[PDB]
């Protein structure tokens, strides 16, 4: 069993999600994975068809599946809509409906793509860092909150269970990688930082196979530029994670290379970081790497098929060098690039 | 009049502060600045001499002067002391005594030093950014604050006068540079961010000669790595400023190049970012660039002698290429490097 709800969304979403499906079907056929999937309406296309971005049929399909493969969502066309039915509200409704409390965003400098990084080649080399960001609490949602003409106030607050559950997702993710977690806080100045640190240390005792270190968020802004290749997994609160994930996201030097996973109680959601790029919808040029790597994330984080996720990543790594898409200075269309990924998957299998 | 209280502090502090004084005496002699200075005990040396880091005589001298030239402070020797008399408490007492509410930290990639940056040469080229960080408020000092076994909480809060006064320091600093301020907030999610943005926009109307743009803190973590050369002045709240100033601080690739200024109601304090480096105290090798640039900051931000500050910066820029200190891969001692700075100041004057 591998039951996937596919929500291809808007703009280039249908193209790049289909590229990811071609990869998953090739794996299913080669490995006997028991893949079953169904496509559901979501985002702008759903608004246009049904009058809302996350209609009942889709909520049901997402609930019933074991993972969501989501394309890009939204665009200029729907920007003038009431908030209640906007594509972005659909995305919040999707994530809330599943209580997804951890966002995982990996930033990887593939070998031979150091040239793309803003960092010098020797610093970019070997970067492969996974930022795990607490998604449902902290100052973004804390109470009290408000403003008057005199002042305004927001509250960074965390309860023990919120810190525990994001930490566990980080330790589990590190087991699948290089078994190293850095937890990030502001424990030398803030009570929430002290509390976060002690809670993560306590949770860490359940994961004796994973090394744990603590760093302050300001020091981490230094380290992600000076020696990012030193990290494996990094876990932190919502606002710090938003900042550091954005910092890590620019190290590979290309938006089309970045996948995202959101994990929690319900069905986990895997999607590209890039948007719907409507100006190139239907052209067959979008770089499907983010989507394909989101399917590798699905294999790894929803299904525990870590060896398979690594095979997909290696095939993508080779394809980026062999037949780079236009965003990397090459000329490979979406389908040609997907075919190159499949050739490498096939070649690695035939050992 | 230019009355300066010199607090040379600990470790390499006396050496590098004297290098800065040689520069200021050369300028005073060439320009007729009316420099008057006195040396006062501060930090570990004061603890050893008087039993406390910020004794009465020094508080008086700081109050009576127009600026403080402060060396590095602290070290291993005093780490086991009660908080009440630690060197770090001395520094907090110094800054509080003067109600210094804005910290200004410039990060500059001097021409021909792009090689030092972690960023590719073409991105490092031309970086000259000044981060202005609100120093006395925001979540670091906000109430309510606390922790229990169940949860912990800290409050990011700002009143209108706190935002106004740090913004004015940023607009004033931009006038002396390239007349461009980017204010940074989290206005798309947080009430404090909305409040900060509207307040800064209102203050900006008093500075029609300075351009103003707003950016979110997460976007700024992207921009300071992908296109830092695009910024001139950046102003933000305490925790965001701590994070972004640390991020900017690594772009030049050398700690010895970074000065700091703290400005507010009382006497403004100019100091290196580097610490006391006690292992090389008395060797005559410390790079005095941070201290000398802190004296340029003093000229600019305390005395408005912007042309003179730029002359000191240009002479330092040439000296770093001609006679680089050991931290830049060269072999110039502290005095030889200071002499090179003086040769360039002399040569630029004799037009």
Swiss-Prot record, chains A, B:
Q: Which gene encodes it?
A: leuB
What are its cofactors? Mg(2+); Mn(2+)
Which residues bind NAD(+) per the record? 75-88, 275-287
Instruction: Give the species this sequence originates from.
Output: Thermus thermophilus (strain ATCC 27634 / DSM 579 / HB8)
Using the UniProt record, name the top-level EC class of this enzyme in a single word: oxidoreductase
Protein name as it appears in the record: 3-isopropylmalate dehydrogenase
Q: Name one GO molecular function term.
A: NAD binding
Q: Which GO terms describe its biological process?
A: L-leucine biosynthetic process
Q: How does it assemble?
A: Homodimer.
Q: Does the keyword Signal apply?
A: no
State the organism's lineage.
Bacteria, Thermotogati, Deinococcota, Deinococci, Thermales
């Amino acid at each position: 069993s591998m039951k996937v709800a596919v929500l291809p969304g808007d703009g280039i979403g249908p193209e790049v999600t289909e590229a990811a499906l071609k990869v998953l079907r090739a794996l299913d056929e080669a490995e006997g994975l028991g893949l079953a999937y169904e496509v559901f309406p979501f985002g702008g296309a759903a608004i246009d068809a049904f009058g809302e971005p996350f209609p009942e049929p889709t909520r049901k399909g997402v609930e019933e599946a074991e993972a969501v493969l989501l394309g890009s969502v939204g665009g200029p066309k729907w920007d003038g809509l009431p908030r209640k039915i906007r594509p972005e509200t659909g995305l919040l409704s999707l994530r809330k409906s599943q209580d997804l409390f951890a966002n995982l965003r990996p930033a990887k400098v593939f070998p031979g793509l150091e040239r793309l990084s803003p960092l010098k080649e020797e610093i970019a080399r070997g970067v492969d860092v996974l930022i795990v960001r607490e998604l449902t609490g902290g100052i973004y949602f804390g109470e009290p909150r408000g403003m008057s003409e005199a002042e305004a106030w927001n509250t960074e607050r965390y309860s023990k269970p919120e810190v525990e559950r994001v930490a566990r997702v980080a330790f589990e993710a590190a087991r699948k990688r290089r078994k190293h977690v850095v937890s990030v806080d502001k424990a030398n100045v803030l009570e929430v930082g002290e509390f976060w640190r002690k809670t993560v240390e306590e949770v860490g005792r359940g994961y004796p196979d994973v090394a744990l270190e603590h760093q302050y968020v300001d020091a981490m802004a230094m380290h992600l530029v000076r020696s990012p290749a030193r990290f494996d997994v990094v876990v932190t609160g919502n606002i710090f994670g938003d900042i550091l994930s954005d910092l890590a996201s620019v190290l590979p030097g290309s938006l089309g290379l970045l996948p995202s996973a959101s994990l929690g109680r319900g069905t986990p959601v895997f999607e590209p970081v890039h948007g719907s790029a409507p100006d190139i919808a239907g052209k067959g040029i979008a770089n499907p790497t983010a989507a394909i790597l989101s399917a590798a994330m699905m294999l790894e984080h929803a299904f525990g098929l870590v060896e398979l996720a690594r095979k997909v990543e290696d095939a993508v790594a080779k394809a980026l060098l062999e037949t780079p898409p236009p965003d990397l200075g090459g000329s490979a269309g979406t389908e040609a690039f997907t075919a190159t990924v499949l050739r490498h998957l096939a070649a690695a299998a035939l050992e």
